[PDB]
Amino acid sequence: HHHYINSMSAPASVQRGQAFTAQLNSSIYVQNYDDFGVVWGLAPPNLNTSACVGCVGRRIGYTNLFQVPPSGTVGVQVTVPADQAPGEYLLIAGASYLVGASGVTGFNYFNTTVQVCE
Amino acid sequence: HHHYINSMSAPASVQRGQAFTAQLNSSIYVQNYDDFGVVWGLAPPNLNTSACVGCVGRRIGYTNLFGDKADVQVPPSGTVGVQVTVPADQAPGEYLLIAGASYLVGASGVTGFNYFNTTVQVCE
Ligand SMILES: *[C@@H]1O[C@H](CO)[C@@H](O)[C@H](O)[C@H]1NC(C)=O
Numbered sequence: 225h226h227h228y229i230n231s232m233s234a235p236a237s238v239q240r241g242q243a244f245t246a247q248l249n250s251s252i253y254v255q256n257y258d259d260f261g262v263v264w265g266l267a268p269p270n271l272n273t274s275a276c277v278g279c280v281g282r283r284i285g286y287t288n289l290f291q292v293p294p295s296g297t298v299g300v301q302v303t304v305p306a307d308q309a310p311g312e313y314l315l316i317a318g319a320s321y322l323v324g325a326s327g328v329t330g331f332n333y334f335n336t337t338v339q340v341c342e
Numbered sequence: 343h344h345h346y347i348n349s350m351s352a353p354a355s356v357q358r359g360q361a362f363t364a365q366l367n368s369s370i371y372v373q374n375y376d377d378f379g380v381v382w383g384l385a386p387p388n389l390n391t392s393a394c395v396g397c398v399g400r401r402i403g404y405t406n407l408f409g410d411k412a413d414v415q416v417p418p419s420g421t422v423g424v425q426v427t428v429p430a431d432q433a434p435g436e437y438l439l440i441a442g443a444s445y446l447v448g449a450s451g452v453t454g455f456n457y458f459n460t461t462v463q464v465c466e
């Protein structure tokens with residue numbers, strides 16, 4: 225229990241209804257750290273997280289994690305629903321976690337721009 | 343898809359090293375609502391959450407709630423029991439049992455944690 229997800233990547237373009245792979249990177253940490261899961265969201269590219277605290281957009285997946293390489297890469301399956309309108313979006317990964325002796329829990333967010341094609 | 347965990351209960355006393363049954367209630371929700379999982383923590387009885395934002399204390403369990411491989415099936419409205427086990431080395435005494443339920447809600451996809459606590463005595 226001493227590694228955390230530190231970043232997320234994904235293809236620049238995806239086809240709706242067709243699964244693709246998102247990559248999650250991890251690194252070692254001194255404090256105890258638990259990655260519980262990752263919610264996958266598809267958001268408008270203009271999303272304002274200050275006005276919409278915690279927002280990830282439309283939920284398109286959830287990955288339970290609680291396997292994961294402590295200091296490397298893991299691939300995760302993600303699908304944009306077939307009915308999604310084409311265009312530019314933000315793909316948002318919301319990683320739930322616990323850290324430390326006090327058990328601080330929360331979400332870390334990672335995003336990338338993706339083009340959703342028919 | 344339209345229900346949410348709104349409360350938690352547990353026994354007044356639990357034996358360390360032994361699993362006990364905690365209860366999670368759920369209610370109907372107007373907007374779309376996902377419960378992803380519940381982290382179970384043992385926190386000092388004096389925990390100030392204003393100073394320790396989002397703290398659950400020592401992690402003693404995690405219940406995955408999403409998908410068909412979910413640990414338990416939450417009824418849209420009602421209660422479900424969850425097996426939670428206090429570590430065998432836990433110091434005896436009074437604690438807060440804290441349940442941290444991760445969620446997503448609404449068309450904007452607001453994600454976060456809801457916290458429910460109850461006082462529990464841990465005995466040898
Ligand atoms: C993830 O980590 C690997 C090295 O472990 C690196 O090659 C890759 O570029 C990283 N991706 C991101 C988005 O940081």
Ligand SMILES: *[C@@H]1O[C@H](CO)[C@@H](O)[C@H](O)[C@H]1NC(C)=O
Nearest residue numbers: 270271272273314333334335
């Ligand atoms: C997307 O991530 C960047 C950092 O990688 C951050 O500055 C930006 O606020 C994020 N956007 C949203 C909508 O979360």
Ligand SMILES: *[C@@H]1O[C@H](CO)[C@@H](O)[C@H](O)[C@H]1NC(C)=O
Nearest residue numbers: 349350351365367419420421
């Ligand atoms: C909801 O939980 C409370 C205790 O937290 C309990 O009194 C009640 O019976 C529960 N709901 C149902 C349907 O029993």
Ligand SMILES: *[C@@H]1O[C@H](CO)[C@@H](O)[C@H](O)[C@H]1NC(C)=O
Nearest residue numbers: 389390391438457458459460
């Ligand atoms: C315990 O739950 C009550 C709700 O009845 C809440 O007011 C209180 O802040 C909780 N305690 C902590 C330490 O969060």
